[PDB]
Design a protein around this ligand. Structure first.
Ligand SMILES: [Ca+2]
Ligand SMILES: [Ca+2]
Ligand SMILES: [Ca+2]
Ligand SMILES: [Ca+2]
Ligand SMILES: [Ca+2]
Ligand SMILES: [Ca+2]
Ligand SMILES: [Ca+2]
Ligand SMILES: [Ca+2]
Ligand SMILES: [Ca+2]
Ligand SMILES: [Ca+2]
Ligand SMILES: [Ca+2]
Ligand SMILES: [Ca+2]
Ligand SMILES: [Ca+2]
Ligand SMILES: [Ca+2]
Ligand SMILES: [Ca+2]
Length: 258
C-alpha cells in the first residue's frame, strides 16, 4: 500500500502489510499482523498497532510519530550523521542536531545507522543494533540484546540479564554492582576491554567449561565471557577493576589462584 504526494491515510488489515506514505503528511495504520511502515518525506503519523511491526525512518526527516502499538516493534534508521535515540524518553534525533527529532512510542527495539549512533533502551527487554560506526549502546533495565557490529563500540547492558555482542573492532563492555548476569560474545578485535566498577577484591574469576566467569563477591552479579578459552577471537584483552587493570596473563593468574 503506497501513498502519493497527497496527505494520505493508509490502513492495512490483519495480514503482514507494507505501507509507504510517500511525500506529504500521512497517517499509516498497519492493523494486526507484522507490518512494515515508512512515512517517507513529510511529517507522518505511523501506527503499527498489534503485531511485531517495523518502521523505516530517516533520522534527518523530523516531525514524525512512530508508534509501535502492542507487540514487539523495531525502528530502523539504517536506510550523513548517526542517530541519538532513547526508547525510555521516547525520541530519536540527528547526531549533532537535537532540533531534528522524531517521537517514538511503544517501540521495543532499535536499529541504528552506518554512522556513530547512541542507542538507549528502556526498562523493558530491548534489542539495540548499532551496525557500522562507533556506537554507544545502553540497555537500561530488563533483559536486552546489544549488537555493536563493526566499529569501536561501547556496550552497557545495565540491570537485568543481557547479551552483549561487541562485534568486530575494539569494543568496551561496562559492568558493575547490580548489573545481574551478563554474557559477552566477542568475534574480533585486538584491543577489546571490560570495565568493572566493582572493588577489585570483590571479584572472583573462574573457568566454567570454555567460558570465563567473573563474579562480584557479595552479590548475584556475574559477567560471563562466552568461549573465552575456545579461541583467541573470543577473548577480551584488558579487564579493569575500578581503577586497576589486568591483562590476559593476569586474568589466567587470578583464575589459577581461584
Ligand atoms: Ca503521501
Ligand atoms: Ca497488517
Ligand atoms: Ca501491525
Ligand atoms: Ca516522514
Ligand atoms: Ca509522508
Ligand atoms: Ca505493534
Ligand atoms: Ca510495542
Ligand atoms: Ca552505527
Ligand atoms: Ca558499531
Ligand atoms: Ca532494557
Ligand atoms: Ca538490561
Ligand atoms: Ca564492534
Ligand atoms: Ca570486538
Ligand atoms: Ca545486566
Ligand atoms: Ca579481542
Amino acid at each position: 500500500i503506497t501513498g502519493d504526494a497527497q496527505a494520505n491515510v493508509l490502513r492495512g488489515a490483519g495480514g503482514a502489510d507494507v505501507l509507504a506514505g510517500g511525500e506529504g503528511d500521512d497517517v499509516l495504520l498497519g492493523g494486526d499482523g507484522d507490518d512494515q511502515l515508512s512515512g517517507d518525506a513529510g511529517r507522518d503519523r505511523l501506527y503499527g498497532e498489534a503485531g511485531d511491526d517495523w518502521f523505516f525512518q530517516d533520522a534527518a526527516n523530523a516531525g514524525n510519530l512512530l508508534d509501535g502499538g502492542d507487540g514487539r516493534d523495531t525502528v530502523d534508521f539504517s536506510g550523513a550523521k548517526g542517530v541519538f535515540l532513547s526508547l525510555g524518553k521516547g525520541f530519536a534525533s540527528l547526531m549533532d542536531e537535537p532540533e531534528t527529532s522524531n517521537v517514538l512510542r511503544n517501540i521495543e527495539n532499535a536499529v541504528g545507522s552506518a554512522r556513530d549512533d547512541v542507542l538507549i533502551g528502556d526498562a523493558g527487554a530491548n534489542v539495540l543494533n548499532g551496525l557500522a560506526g562507533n556506537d554507544v549502546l545502553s540497555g537500561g533495565a530488563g533483559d536486552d540484546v546489544l549488537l555493536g557490529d563493526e566499529g569501536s563500540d561501547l556496550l552497557s547492558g545495565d540491570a537485568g540479564n543481557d547479551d552483549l555482542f561487541g562485534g568486530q573492532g575494539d569494543d568496551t563492555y561496562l559492568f558493575g554492582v547490580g548489573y545481574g548476569h551478563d554474557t559477552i560474545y566477542e568475534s574480533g578485535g585486538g584491543h577489546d576491554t571490560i570495565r568493572i566498577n566493582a572493588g577489585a577484591d570483590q571479584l572472583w574469576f573462574a573457568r566454567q567449561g570454555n567460558d570465563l566467569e567473573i563474579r562480584i563477591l557479595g552479590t548475584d552479579d556475574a559477567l560471563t565471557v562466552h568461549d573465552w578459552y575456545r579461541d583467541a577471537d573470543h577473548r577480551v584483552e584488558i579487564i579493569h577493576a575500578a581503577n586497576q587493570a589486568v591483562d590476559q596473563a593476569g586474568i589466567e593468574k587470578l583464575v589459577e589462584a581461584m
